[PDB]
Amino acid sequence: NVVIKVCEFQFCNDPFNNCTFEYVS
Amino acid sequence: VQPTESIVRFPNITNLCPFGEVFNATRFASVYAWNRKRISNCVADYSVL
Ligand SMILES: *[C@@H]1O[C@H](CO)[C@@H](O[C@@H]2O[C@H](CO)[C@@H](O[C@@H]3O[C@H](CO)[C@@H](O)[C@H](O)[C@@H]3O)[C@H](O)[C@H]2NC(C)=O)[C@H](O)[C@H]1NC(C)=O
Ligand SMILES: *[C@@H]1O[C@H](CO)[C@@H](O)[C@H](O)[C@H]1NC(C)=O
């Protein structure tokens, strides 16, 4: 499903902290 | 015609606050190493407290 997150991610080009919200549709 | 009563409606309650885990934690935090989290996007059922 659609996944939503709000972290301070280190992934400057692709993934393949501070996560104050998460959701899945 | 006067309004005979007042009706109030909202969506069903869902997604209660993590207080239910916090105040049932046998591992409850030592004051020299106190710990926390943001309770957000939740039903804060403070009436139960
Ligand atoms: C921490 O966990 C406890 C245990 O689940 C939560 O409080 C207690 O929750 C139970 C339901 O799981 C309540 O029991 C029910 O009460 C009604 C009304 O008297 C009765 O008709 C049912 O047969 C059943 O016994 C219980 O009243 C409730 N309170 C206490 C003091 O045991 C508690 O809510 C959790 N902590 C937080 C902050 O949510
Ligand atoms: C985000 O993370 C940094 C480093 O861990 C921390 O200083 C800051 O207070 C955090 N802020 C939030 C809103 O989580």
User: Which CB contacts under 8 angstroms, 24+ apart, belong to B7-15?
Assistant: B13/B43, B13/B45, B14/B43, B15/B41, B15/B42, B15/B43
CA distance B17 to chain A (A): 14
Query: Which resolution in angstroms does this entry have?
Result: 3.4
What distance in Å separates the CA atoms of residue A2 and residue B33, rounded to the nearest whole number?
A: 37
Question: Smallest Cα–Cα separation from B48: which of B9, B12, B10, B22?
Answer: B22
**CA proximity to B48, closest of B4, B16, B8:** B16
The residues lining ligand 2, judged by C-beta closer than 6 Å to any ligand atom, are: A 17-18, 20
Is B41 in the A-facing interface, judged by CB distances under 8 Å? Answer: yes
